[PDB]
């Protein structure tokens, strides 16, 4: 019954600071869960960006993301936000907010195509 909905741009210039924000309803943020961001370049496979936790875990990302990704949780607004500084046009991808639980990523977001273009 959980529902995740992304919000933010889908068209940004390269070499800028990208930021989305996924709203969460149907459940609580501070659960046994990793509120995660996972992307997918178009026509290609998935690419797990990283997560954040509703407990007190430090967020752990994919090291291929070059330490430009800061996922920040907002427990007072039931949200959690992706960041991506210094983007390129090759970072055009469908973005997905999701929730790792005792099962593996049950409720996703719908996933929105961020097409980085100059």
């Amino acid at each position: 019954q959980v529902q995740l909905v992304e919000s933010g741009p889908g068209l940004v210039r390269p070499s800028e600071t990208l930021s989305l924000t996924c709203a969460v309803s149907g459940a609580s943020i501070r659960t046994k869960a990793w509120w995660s961001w996972i992307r997918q370049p178009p026509g290609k496979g998935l690419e797990w960006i990283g997560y954040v936790s509703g407990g007190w875990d430090l967020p752990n990302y994919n090291p291929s993301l070059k330490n430009r990704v800061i996922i920040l949780k907002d427990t007072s607004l039931n949200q959690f936000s992706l960041r991506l500084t210094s983007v390129t046009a090759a970072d055009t991808a469908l973005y997905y907010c999701a929730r790792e639980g005792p099962e593996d990523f049950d409720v996703w977001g719908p996933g929105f195509l961020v097409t980085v273009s100059s």
Partner: peptide, 8 residues
């Protein structure tokens, strides 16, 4: 406090 921690 809205949606509190129901940690399993």
């Amino acid at each position: 406090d809205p949606n509190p921690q129901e940690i399993h």
